[PDB]
Each structure stands twice: as C-alpha cells, then as structure tokens.
C-alpha cells in the first residue's frame, strides 16, 4: 500500500464498494413497489 | 396510478439520489490518494 495505509485504502476501496451494493438495495424495493 | 401514496415514491426517489450524491464524494477522496 504505497499510499495511505493498506488498513485504511483498502478500508475505503471495500467500503465505496459495499455501497454500490447499499444502493441497489434501495431501488430493488422501489422497482417491485413500481411494478405493484 | 403508482403503487403507495405519491409522497411515499417521493421520499424514497428523493432520498435515493442523496445516495449517489454522496458515493460521488467518496470517489474523489480516492482520487487524492492516487494524485500523489
């Protein structure tokens, strides 16, 4: 980890990561809402 | 007309923006420690 500590780059790559995930989540609910 | 109440699909619509608002914000604190 050349830059900012491993423990913290990859603290901050994983966790922009699992927000993808977070916002998907979000409009799962929306799309079936939508489709009801 | 749309599933629940119009204010219900708004909250949620609304709301989910802020969401990629932020991600946006993440992104670029990543692009510093990349910069160098």
């Known amino acids: ?3 900012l500590s491993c423990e ?3 603290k ?3 966790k ?3 927000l993808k995930r977070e ?3 979000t409009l799962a609910r ?3 809402a939508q489709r009801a």
Request: glycine share 6%; aromatic share 12%; hydrophobic share 30%.
């Open 16 to 18: 922009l990561a699992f």
């Open 30 to 32: 929306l799309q079936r």
């Open 12 to 14: 901050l790559k994983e």
């Open 1 to 3: 980890g050349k830059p």
């Open 23 to 25: 916002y998907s989540k």
């Open 8 to 10: 913290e780059k990859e």
